[PDB]
Amino acid sequence: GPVIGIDLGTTYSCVGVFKNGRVEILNNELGNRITPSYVSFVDGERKVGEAAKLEATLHPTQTVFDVKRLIGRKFDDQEVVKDRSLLPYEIVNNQGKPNIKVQIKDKDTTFAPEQISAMVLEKMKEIAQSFLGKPVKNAVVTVPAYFNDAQRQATKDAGTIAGLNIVRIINEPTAAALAYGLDKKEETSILVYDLGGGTFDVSILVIDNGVFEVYATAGNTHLGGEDFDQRVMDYFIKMFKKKNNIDLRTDKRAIQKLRKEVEIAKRNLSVVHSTQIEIEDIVEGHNFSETLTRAKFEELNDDLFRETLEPVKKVLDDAKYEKSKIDEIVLVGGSTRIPKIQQIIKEFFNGKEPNRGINPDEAVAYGAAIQAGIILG
Numbered sequence: 575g576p577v578i579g580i581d582l583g584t585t586y587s588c589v590g591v592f593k594n595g596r597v598e599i600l601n602n603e604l605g606n607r608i609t610p611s612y613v614s615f616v617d618g619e620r621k622v623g624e625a626a627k628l629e630a631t632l633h634p635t636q637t638v639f640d641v642k643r644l645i646g647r648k649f650d651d652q653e654v655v656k657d658r659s660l661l662p663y664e665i666v667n668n669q670g671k672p673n674i675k676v677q678i679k680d681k682d683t684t685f686a687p688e689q690i691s692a693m694v695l696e697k698m699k700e701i702a703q704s705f706l707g708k709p710v711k712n713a714v715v716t717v718p719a720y721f722n723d724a725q726r727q728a729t730k731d732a733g734t735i736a737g738l739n740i741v742r743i744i745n746e747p748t749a750a751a752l753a754y755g756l757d758k759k760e761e762t763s764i765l766v767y768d769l770g771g772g773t774f775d776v777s778i779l780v781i782d783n784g785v786f787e788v789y790a791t792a793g794n795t796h797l798g799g800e801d802f803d804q805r806v807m808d809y810f811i812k813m814f815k816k817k818n819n820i821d822l823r824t825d826k827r828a829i830q831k832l833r834k835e836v837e838i839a840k841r842n843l844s845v846v847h848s849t850q851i852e853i854e855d856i857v858e859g860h861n862f863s864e865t866l867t868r869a870k871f872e873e874l875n876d877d878l879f880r881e882t883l884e885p886v887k888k889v890l891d892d893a894k895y896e897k898s899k900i901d902e903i904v905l906v907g908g909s910t911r912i913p914k915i916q917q918i919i920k921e922f923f924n925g926k927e928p929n930r931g932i933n934p935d936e937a938v939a940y941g942a943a944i945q946a947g948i949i950l951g
């Protein structure tokens with residue numbers, strides 16, 4: 575049968591197929607190549623993807639996301655304790671393991687993380703089946719390089735629940751190296767800088783005669799694009815209060831509409847220098863109309879951009895590497911399109927240029943698809 579490739583990300587998932595000697599990254603039913611990793615349990619309906627994400631605003635306790643943060647971990651791990659305090663849906667202690675609790679038709683229902691991740695995998699599988707017009711039973715699925723045996727096994731178990739045999743788990747850095755087609759011959763040391771919507775990961779990947787090994791990993795589990803948007807929102811919430819004596823945080827619907835326009839404005843400022851953020855009647859009788867420059871966008875976030883170099887220093891130190899030992903810097907995740915990010919990395923690497931695909935959110939799924947093709951021969 576076919577083997578598909580899935581990037582099971584913290585904030586999103588992406589599915590690729592390898593067919594007629596090319597990788598195709600598939601669109602979801604709404605025409606996007608990225609599906610938000612969200613599942614909602616409201617009014618006796620289950621939704622998966624953007625339709626679930628949209629329920630988060632009015633149904634924050636029934637809308638599950640960021641499950642990758644919980645999968646294969648223990649309820650008392652410091653990281654899960656921190657996540658229970660950040661996440662608005664109920665996380666309960668099932669015999670030492672975090673489980674998700676929600677209501678379906680008012681009934682208390684508990685899920686393992688791998689059961690919610692299975693629902694994201696199910697949807698990616700259905701996109702692949704309808705595209706290939708065949709059943710799909712096998713997949714390459716990616717995980718972070720720092721995932722331990724229980725986190726990898728819990729991801730495999732997610733596959734099994736979704737009716738997917740996970741024939742191979744590969745780390746996200748390896749998947750990126752496969753996508754960018756880094757020469758497998760002789761020896762290459764690669765810094766993989768992966769700045770996503772929710773998380774930052776950096777790995778030293780060494781490629782030696784077609785053998786891939788991650789020598790060191792570090793990161794910041796709570797640093798990504800969504801933080802850069804929150805810094806902009808904070809700024810404009812302050813200004814709108816100053817100007818109109820309206821605190822937009824008093825209206826959940828206003829904050830949702832602002833967040834959407836702020837995300838687009840940030841994307842615009844990776845290409846242009848100045849952009850308009852506009853919402854008619856952000857509340858009744860009050861338009862939101864503001865300009866954001868690249869310079870102000872950077873000023874609002876410069877300490878977070880700069881923070882990304884602390885994990886870079888840690889992996890160089892952990893692997894007893896000097897900046898020079900790094901042969902190529904590869905960038906993954908849409909957040910790496912921010913010019914200032916590219917600039918800061920370059921100057922850290924004493925002038926060296928980094929490589930950024932042009933679909934950096936799809937590189938990991940692309941690599942997983944390539945791995946599927948490699949396995950099929």
Ligand SMILES: Nc1ncnc2c1nc(N)n2[C@@H]1O[C@H](CO)[C@@H](O)[C@H]1O
Nearest residue numbers: 770771799800840841844908909911
């Ligand atoms: N043009 C762009 N400039 C800055 N950030 C961008 C971006 N494109 C994406 N996807 N991103 C962000 O990447 C993350 C993963 O999708 C999200 O936080 C996007 O906003």
